[PDB]
Ligand binder design. Structure first.
Ligand SMILES: Nc1ncnc2c1ncn2[C@@H]1O[C@H](COP(=O)(O)OP(=O)(O)O)[C@@H](O)[C@H]1O
Ligand SMILES: [Mg+2]
Ligand SMILES: [Mg+2]
Lengths: 746, 184
């Protein structure tokens, strides 16, 4: 309880998530009279308290956990003032670095600052991405244990540029005669194959890129190794409204007029069924004909020969032409490709395969028992599904092959002693419409934040063992029940892979199975009130409503072996047989391939020690260096920052070294009372100032405080300092009064 | 996870394999042969009984018994030999470790499912078992939830109307002509 005249509080507002407010009448233990901006009128109805505000000296601190009052208003305010007023974009919460897109360039990344950060401990400096890279480089020396820097956030938050600078740090401080050129020259390739225009923004990354920087026995940089995970295969063949698929297809179509690409017989970017679907072939302000050239130049720099470059573009033109193969039904249970079909003719020319063999195998499938073998016609729906699954399989193998030749260039022969690994992964996502892609992204982010919450929980048990404080005080948010909802058997994914193979399964019967299995059995699964074709999962960040329409089309892969054996028979050019050179994997659905890829990522990260960077995007409009409250709060919830802050607020947020406590509160402690050691001095003085220890704890090295007690100490400190100023000023002012008085008497 | 075994005891053939396979790994005639002639050569290595393809190969020397006729198991010691051969020799799998989905023709005696279960749990010690009507599986196999399945084996013929996933058990016809009565 503190609320008085001249107190300040935060109040909610639909325009800006909180308004500052002056408390205009003292609180009495039932409705509050408040002054505001824009004059004053409110009375504010408490319900069976307003958030209460940190004294202005605290706000703007380097570390959001160093605040005395912790809540969403305080956090949003600190980040807003640091970004707008001080032009500082980096901030700490707990262990987490928080980074805000200044979204215009800055001096700050200079080599002078790189050198200034080297050797510094993370609390010695103002926050910067180099402070995280430096802490990683330290921890890799202090223990041989490898280190991971996990960069996460919405698309456009600056995850790629943050990784760029994090690598520039290692390459400056460790590096010597090169990795930097090759890694940065790889980006236009991986962006071309792996980024797409999403609804909310262009140039979204649809995969988790992981760069391992390798070090030798003396922590010189050896080289790098690039891995990729969680590739969004389904975008190759299906696109929502005003999406595109991966840029490479559009750079290719825009380059169709070039003489190398005449043979590929490409058309405009909406001639093909796999690029037409989105209805938006041109990005505003991107010239795809030139991004093509920057891609081919990046390939050339990484030493993919022009022969292989033309192989790559030949296969991509293959996929585009394949998409235009149209199947005619001849029966309810059989279909055929019409005679002399032009898209297939061009496809078989490009790939160098017999037209009538592909024409046969696209429309038929084959079974063999141990003795004897059968050839089945298939329905037009299964033919279209098989062709789409073949296109997805080609694209995924091409992607793994380009990544493998990049690794050929990035690897170096010296034996890697240890690595620091940097992970650029899309953040928790929520859109006015959410579909199977979003469901996968949010499941991956559930796993990553399980890891995060366990790491933080471990770290604070170990700090309490450094400080002999009971463990029972601390608890953590457990999101295993939602992972089990999505992932366990009879989970949302398991019933989807089942409905993919049950006869005449559909999104409507899938949804019915979900309701039957979970609707009132699980607390985290909910049905939307007015629909039968959607369901709600209560993720850590928010409730998200997913739409069942078109999960099953996106879910399905089965690649008919006979089509791979036709492609593997190709003799025209080197690359296409080489892709498929090394089963059950052909049956696996997109959801199951995603689950497995995510388990590989988590096996990679749990073997490591993480350091976290969260990136947030200030504004949707690309305005330089301005900030929107309503988005930023959504970002800071999606990053789990607000939960981390709340959890810390439940415990003992504020931790003061005894000597810093003295440096602050010498005014509180009497020139008589101070002892021959300040640790015992402050141990006494605080017991003087606050009667009950439960507000605080005494560690070996720090005083621990519950939230708010520091603001109290600053209040009483400032009132006592003003009473001292009253004494001294009153004496000097009274002297001048005396002086002029006696002059008048004189 | 452990796959289930899937095993179908036709009158004429055994088909067996693992769940999720697209076609059966073992198909062999469900036939047991015993030698019917004097054993003249010493040290040849006599055998009391052949099963399946072994009994086909030797069949000039053997009396061949079918242990299922008309979908009814008519002597159990042979059928237990046939299952022993199915798990251990053809699939090469420990039956301790896999659920087994068995199969049966509709409307046949109830003592046949009881014994066919008792032998799986006592003899083979299978973890878990099921028994499924033959004609129901052909709809899963043909992508349909509605149809009237005509199914005809070596031993039995039956119709099973299924509409929208409900069987109509009063309309089930069983007819006792099959491939073996065609052969005779
Ligand atoms: N720290 C920064 N300093 C200057 N510009 C930045 C910074 N972070 C992001 N940007 C700008 O924002 C753009 C979008 O961020 P980027 O990292 O490219 O996308 P994503 O984070 O989705 O990969 C960058 O291309 C760059 O123009
Ligand atoms: Mg990116
Ligand atoms: Mg049969």
């Amino acid at each position: 309880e503190l609320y008085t005249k001249y107190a300040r509080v935060w109040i909610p507002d639909p325009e800006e998530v909180w308004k500052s407010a002056e408390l205009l009448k003292d609180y009495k233990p039932k409705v509050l009279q408040l002054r505001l901006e824009e004059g004053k009128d409110l009375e504010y109805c408490l319900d069976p308290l307003p958030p209460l505000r940190n004294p202005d000296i605290l706000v703007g601190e380097n570390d959001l956990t160093a605040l005395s009052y912790l809540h969403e208003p305080a956090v949003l305010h600190n980040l807003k003032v640091r970004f707008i007023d001080s032009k500082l974009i980096y901030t700490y919460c707990g262990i987490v670095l928080v980074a805000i897109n200044p979204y215009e360039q800055l001096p700050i990344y200079g080599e002078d600052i790189i050198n200034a950060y080297s050797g510094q401990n993370m609390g010695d400096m103002d926050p910067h991405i180099f402070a995280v890279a430096e802490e990683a480089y330290k921890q890799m020396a202090r223990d041989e244990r490898n280190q991971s820097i996990i960069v996460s956030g919405e698309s456009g938050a600056g995850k790629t540029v943050s990784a760029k600078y994090a690598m520039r740090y290692f390459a400056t401080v460790s590096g010597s005669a090169n990795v930097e050129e090759k890694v940065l020259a790889s980006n236009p390739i991986m962006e071309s194959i792996g980024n797409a225009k999403t609804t909310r923004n262009d140039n979204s990354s649809r995969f988790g890129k992981y760069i391992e920087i390798g070090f030798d026995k003396r922590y010189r940089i050896i080289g790098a190794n690039m891995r990729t995970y969680l590739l969004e295969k389904s975008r190759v063949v299906f696109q929502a409204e005003e999406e595109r698929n991966y840029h490479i297809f559009y750079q290719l179509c825009a380059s169709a007029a070039l003489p190398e690409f005449k043979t590929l017989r490409l058309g405009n970017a909406n001639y093909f069924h796999y690029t037409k679907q989105g209805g938006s072939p041109v990005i505003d302000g991107i010239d795809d004909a030139k991004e093509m050239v920057n891609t081919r130049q990046a390939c050339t720099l990484l030493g993919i020969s022009d022969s292989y470059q033309m192989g790559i573009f030949r296969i991509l033109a293959g996929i585009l032409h394949l998409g235009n193969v149209e199947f005619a039904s001849r029966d309810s249970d059989s279909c055929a490709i019409p005679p002399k079909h032009d898209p297939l003719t061009i496809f078989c020319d490009l790939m160098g395969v017999d037209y009538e063999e592909m024409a046969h195998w696209l429309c038929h499938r084959k079974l063999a028992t141990a003795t004897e073998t059968y050839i089945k016609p298939i329905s037009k729906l299964h033919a279209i599904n098989a062709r789409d699954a073949l296109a997805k399989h080609i694209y995924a193998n091409l992607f793994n092959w380009i990544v493998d030749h990049v690794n050929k260039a990035l690897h170096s022969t010296v034996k890697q002693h240890s690595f620091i690994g940097v992970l650029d992964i899309y953040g928790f996502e929520t859109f006015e419409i959410n579909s199977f892609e979003q469901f996968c992204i949010n499941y991956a982010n559930e796993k990553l934040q399980q890891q995060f919450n366990m790491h933080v929980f471990k770290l604070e048990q170990e700090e309490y063992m450094k400080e002999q404080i009971p463990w029972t005080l601390i608890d953590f948010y457990d999101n295993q029940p939602c992972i089990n909802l999505i992932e366990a058997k009879m989970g949302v994914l398991d019933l989807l892979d089942e409905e993919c193979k049950m006869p005449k399964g559909s999104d409507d019967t899938w949804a019915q199975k979900l309701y039957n299995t979970h609707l009132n059995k699980c607390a985290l699964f909910e049905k939307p009130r007015l629909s039968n074709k959607a369901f709600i999962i209560k993720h850590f960040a928010d409730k998200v409503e997913y739409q069942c329409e078109g999960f099953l089309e996106k879910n399905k892969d089965t690649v008919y072996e006979e089509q791979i054996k036709v492609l593997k028979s190709s003799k025209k050019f080197k690359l296409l047989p080489e892709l498929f050179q090394d089963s059950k994997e052909h049956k696996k659905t997109v959801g199951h391939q995603f689950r497995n890829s995510l388990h590989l990522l988590m096996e990679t990260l749990n073997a490591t020690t993480p350091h976290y960077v969260r990136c947030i995007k200030p504004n949707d409009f690309k305005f330089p260096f301005t900030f929107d409250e309503k988005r930023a709060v959504q970002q800071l919830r999606a990053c789990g920052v607000l939960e981390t802050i709340r959890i810390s607020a439940a415990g003992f947020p504020s931790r003061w070294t005894y000597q810093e406590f003295f440096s602050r509160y010498r005014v509180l402690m009497k020139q008589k009372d101070v002892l021959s050691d300040r640790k015992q001095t402050c141990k006494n003085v605080l017991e003087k100032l606050i009667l009950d220890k439960d507000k605080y704890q005494f560690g070996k090295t720090k005083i621990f405080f519950r939230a708010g007690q520091v603001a109290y100490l600053e209040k009483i400190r400032a009132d006592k300092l003003r009473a001292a100023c009253i004494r001294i000023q009153k004496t000097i002012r009274g002297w001048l009064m005396r002086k002029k008085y006696m002059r008048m008497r004189r | 996870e452990t796959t289930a075994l899937v095993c179908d005891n036709g009158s004429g053939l055994v088909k067996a394999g693992f769940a999720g396979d697209d076609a059966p790994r073992a198909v062999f005639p469900s036939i047991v042969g015993r030698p019917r002639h004097q054993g003249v050569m010493v040290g040849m290595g006599q055998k009391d009984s052949y099963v399946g393809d072994e009994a086909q190969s030797k069949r000039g020397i053997l009396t061949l018994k079918y242990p299922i006729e008309h979908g009814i198991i008519t002597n159990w010691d042979d059928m237990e030999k046939i299952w022993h051969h199915t798990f251990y020799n053809e699939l090469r799998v420990a039956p301790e470790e896999h659920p087994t989905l068995l199969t049966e023709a509709p409307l046949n005696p109830k003592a046949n499912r009881e014994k066919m279960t008792q032998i799986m749990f006592e003899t083979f010690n299978v973890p878990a078992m099921y028994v499924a009507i033959q004609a129901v599986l052909s709809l899963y196999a043909s992508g349909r939830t509605t149809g009237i399945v005509l199914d005809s084996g070596d031993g039995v013929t039956h119709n099973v109307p299924i509409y929208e996933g409900y069987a109509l058990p009063h309309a089930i016809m069983r007819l006792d002509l099959a491939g073996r009565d065609l052969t005779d």
